[PDB]
Design a binder for this molecule. Structure first.
Ligand SMILES: [K+]
Ligand SMILES: [K+]
Ligand SMILES: [Mg+2]
Ligand SMILES: [Mg+2]
Ligand SMILES: [Mg+2]
Ligand SMILES: [Mg+2]
Ligand SMILES: [Mg+2]
Ligand SMILES: [Mg+2]
Ligand SMILES: [Mg+2]
Ligand SMILES: [Mg+2]
Ligand SMILES: [Mg+2]
Ligand SMILES: [Mg+2]
Ligand SMILES: [Mg+2]
Lengths: 108, 299, 50, 134
RNA sequence: UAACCCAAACUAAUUAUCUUCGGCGUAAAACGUGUCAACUAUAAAUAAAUAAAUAGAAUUAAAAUCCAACUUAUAUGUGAAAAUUCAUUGUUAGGACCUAAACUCAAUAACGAAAGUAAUUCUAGUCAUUUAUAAUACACGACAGCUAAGACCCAAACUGGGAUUAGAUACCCCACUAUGCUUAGCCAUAAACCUAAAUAAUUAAAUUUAACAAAACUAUUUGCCAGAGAACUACUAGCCAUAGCUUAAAACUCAAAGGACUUGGCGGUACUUUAUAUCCAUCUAGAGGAGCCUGUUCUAUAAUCGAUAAACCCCGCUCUACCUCACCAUCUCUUGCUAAUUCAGCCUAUAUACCGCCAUCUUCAGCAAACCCUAAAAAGGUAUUAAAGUAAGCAAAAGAAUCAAACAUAAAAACGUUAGGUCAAGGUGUAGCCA
């Protein structure tokens, strides 16, 4: 662009950073609604443990439960955090192990 | 032609067709038999298949052995083979009754699908042929956009002779479109699956050939004032007067384009045209592409 | 679905006319007139006038 | 710039290509030499892939006459392909190859003998990991 | 388990800190065409006189069409037919018509802003603003399409009849229509692209500054672009358009999308030469039938195993009455071949862990290390009146054997191909059995 064109337009317009699953918040608290399995996109082949939760904001989201084995059930309380599950499409939330009803993986 | 080798999709096609348990199914152009296998595994009481190619008959016969007493194979043309008495007469139902226990499903080439449905549409008007059992439903494959026209509504760019002819005789529903990549040889167009159920009361109650002529003359020029197309039904000497009378009696604005002619509009035209054909029987035989050939001093 | 599009087009244009008419009523009412200017009739500009 | 720049269907293509190439060789359109050769065409056989087009021309008695006819015909085969695309006989034409057909000589031979015949009365390797260690 | 990092912290989540002097032929982007403003830059006082710009009027050579005379028995059409046709056909230095389009020239490169424009004649007509720079204005805008009235030679979506195929709504044939033409109105779209914005420079900066296009680069002014799909989409607004046209998002979802090159492959390599006891042909004796001998499969038995398309089937076997023997039934032995050994022994599973020895293409012709060169190389490296290639191996050839000589026959035949065959020639990895 010419200097006259740069002057008339000024600095480049920067669209604001889009909010993610946590809505620009470190963590959210949600109530478990259902516990189900999600199938990772091929080439990945597994039965990943996830749960649907109603977050404090009022929306409903799917959250991956990390660790080998969880005791979560409906009506339980959990603290979810950010971080996408790469193989699971649409799963942008994860459960925090060791907070509220969710407990640390049981080393056996 | 295009073949379907995916057993998952044939099972999906049967699943889309609904419950075939205890139903007398007539399959057209079974070919390799992928659809035939799915129909046989749907608790079908009796299945009759007509394959014109003798090369595929041995494959069908082998499938018949795998399903003893469930498969019937005829080496013939679907366009000519008569199924009026293929199934017992006790399953026949009245035209106003619920659809009989007869359902015609099949994946045919598009060369065969278009002539087959046109002949069957006349049979629906005649209530004969495959429709002697009543308002038999047909789940047939067509070219993606031919199916769009079979279901296209008034004013649609796909609205044409397929829309008026098919819809006035049947309730036409486009189920889904199958991708072409899985077909051998590969077609460059997708394949639309259409479900057709004959109507208890046809939208137009005139001879099938009369409706076909009126629909054809109307849609010969899609972008013209319909008055242009309807004029070709009448000899030039009486074209101006008769065309004005026809539109005046049918209560249609002469400037309405063929695409904006609804099913009820054609019914009014067909009803008026029927009276005119009774007044002059020679009018029904007029062809504008032949009178003009024979007008130039035929002698 | 062209039929619906024409139906949507004719109903969209009708709302487009009402918005035009209402915007003209706001102007004279705000100015303090209690009736539209004498010999004025809002032109119908979105109808099949051509 | 210039230097860089420089079943039923086969029955239809085989017959039409023969019908057209016969006309090209009946005039000097290809060349005056090709016209003077007075070449005759037995048949045209197009391959299934359409990679090439065989043109069978009735060979003669003299080998020298045939050797000359072959060279002249082959040189013009590329140009002959141009004339068929330009007159709009066929949109796509394969590289035309000229083949000999000596059956014509045999066909005359049979009649001569047959007339005279006596019928009688009726990763680790790629990586520096191994190297860095020592 | 060890190591590494940080350390009274540590690791996750979230948020913030980094912000336009870059581009617009092929990747995002010059967005159909010209003209008039205000700025910003620039500086000269010309232009035009041009072959097919454009509009109008008149005109007509070739080929059709129609009427008439004469006239074959056919004409038409395809790769081959059918349909169509005899109210046809051929000829006419006969008449009528003036519909439509403009051969050669044109191997030319003119005109116009673009679209576009080349039969002849005549009339009107292009021209000076220093130059670049314009929309919310004005005027145009191929083809296709609509409206009304005409035209209609031929062509022709479509429609109908005839063929085709395992079947084509296809490709092909015949007939005919919208339409292509004209005069009045509308539509405003093209890969409307020379895919190049418009101007004034320069040819040196020891500048292929990716590559392919079209040598490169500088200055000026405007327009445009900012990862991809969603999207020539939704909505809004304008419009004789009403499925349209122009303008043009978000959610959403991902780590790619995209461009130019180079290679390898197989596809239908079916094409031209090719095989040589071979693909067909030629020739001789056989096999395929009968009887037996023998291998295999099957059936079948308490009763081996392996080979088992070419490249198994008188195969391991140049060899099973016992032995051979690895199989089956039944009885018996437990430190049970050896100098020693909580050891001996093991034809127990995997030839898809291997050695070994082979089949196969095969008497096929390739496999090619080390150097050297390239405006960078993903690779390539030949010219003999020679132009970047070179000097060494492996196979072939040669040599030797069949006891003169040749020829022939044997032998030889690299690297790969078939996880080809063989754990049962033997040896062996791993796992399994030890009254
Ligand atoms: K037809
Ligand atoms: K081996
Ligand atoms: Mg682009
Ligand atoms: Mg004229
Ligand atoms: Mg003049
Ligand atoms: Mg016409
Ligand atoms: Mg909007
Ligand atoms: Mg084996
Ligand atoms: Mg023995
Ligand atoms: Mg023994
Ligand atoms: Mg043993
Ligand atoms: Mg020797
Ligand atoms: Mg040798």
């Amino acid at each position: 662009a010419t200097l006259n064109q740069m002057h008339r337009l000024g600095p480049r317009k920067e669209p604001p950073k889009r909010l993610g699953p946590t809505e620009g918040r470190p963590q959210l608290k949600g109530v478990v609604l259902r516990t189900f399995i999600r199938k990772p996109k091929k080439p990945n082949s597994a039965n990943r443990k996830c749960c649907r939760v109603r977050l404090s904001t009022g929306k409903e989201a799917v959250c991956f439960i990390p660790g080998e084995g969880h005791t979560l059930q409906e009506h339980h309380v959990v603290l979810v955090e950010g971080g996408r599950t790469q193989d699971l499409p649409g799963v942008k939330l994860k459960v925090v192990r060791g907070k509220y009803d969710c407990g640390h993986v049981q080393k056996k | 032609q295009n073949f379907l080798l995916d057993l998952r999709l044939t099972d999906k096609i049967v699943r889309k067709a609904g419950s075939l348990a205890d139903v007398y199914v007539y399959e057209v152009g079974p070919g390799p038999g992928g659809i035939t296998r799915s129909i046989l595994n749907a608790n079908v009481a009796e299945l009759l298949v007509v394959e014109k190619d003798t090369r595929f008959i041995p494959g069908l016969q082998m499938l018949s052995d795998a399903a003893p007493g469930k498969l019937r194979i005829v080496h013939g043309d679907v366009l000519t083979y008569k199924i009026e008495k293929a199934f017992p007469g006790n399953i026949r139902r009245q035209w106003e009754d619920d659809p009989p226990n007869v359902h015609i499903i099949g994946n045919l080439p598009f060369s065969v699908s278009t002539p087959l449905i046109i002949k069957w549409l006349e049979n629906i008007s005649l209530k004969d042929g495959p429709f002697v059992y009543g308002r038999t439903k047909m789940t047939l494959t067509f070219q993606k956009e031919v199916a769009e026209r079979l279901v296209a509504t008034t004013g649609s760019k796909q609205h044409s002779r397929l829309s008026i002819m098919a819809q006035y005789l049947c309730n036409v529903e486009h189920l889904f479109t199958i991708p072409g990549k899985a077909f051998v040889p590969k077609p460059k167009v997708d394949v639309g699956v259409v479900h057709l159920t004959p109507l208890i009361e046809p939208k137009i109650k005139q001879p099938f050939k009369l409706v076909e002529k009126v629909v054809q003359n109307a849609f010969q020029f899609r972008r013209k004032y319909c008055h242009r197309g309807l004029g070709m039904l009448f000899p030039e000497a009486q074209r101006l007067e008769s065309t004005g009378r026809l539109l005046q009696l049918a209560d249609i604005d002469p400037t309405l384009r063929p695409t904006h002619l609804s099913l009820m509009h054609f019914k009014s035209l067909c009803d008026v045209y029927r009276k005119m054909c009774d007044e002059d029987p020679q009018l029904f035989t007029y062809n504008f592409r032949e009178e003009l050939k024979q007008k130039k001093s035929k002698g | 679905t062209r039929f619906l599009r024409r139906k949507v087009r004719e109903g969209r244009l009708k709302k487009k006319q009402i918005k035009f008419e209402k915007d003209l009523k706001r102007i004279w009412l705000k100015a303090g007139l209690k009736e539209a200017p004498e010999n004025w009739q809002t032109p119908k500009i979105y109808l099949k006038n051509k | 710039n210039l230097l860089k720049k420089f079943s039923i269907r086969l029955r239809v293509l085989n017959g039409l290509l023969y019908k057209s190439l016969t006309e090209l060789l009946c005039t000097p359109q290809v060349s005056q030499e090709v016209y003077d050769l007075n070449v005759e065409l037995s048949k045209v056989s197009v391959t299934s892939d359409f990679s090439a087009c065989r043109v069978y021309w009735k060979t003669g008695v003299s080998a020298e006459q045939n050797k000359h006819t072959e060279s002249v015909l082959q040189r013009s085969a590329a140009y002959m392909r141009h004339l068929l695309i330009s007159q709009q006989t066929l949109r796509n034409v394969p590289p035309i190859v000229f083949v000999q057909d000596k059956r014509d000589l045999v066909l005359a031979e049979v009649d001569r003998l047959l007339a005279e015949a006596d019928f009688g009365p009726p990763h680790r390797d790629a990586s520096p990991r191994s190297f860095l260690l020592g």
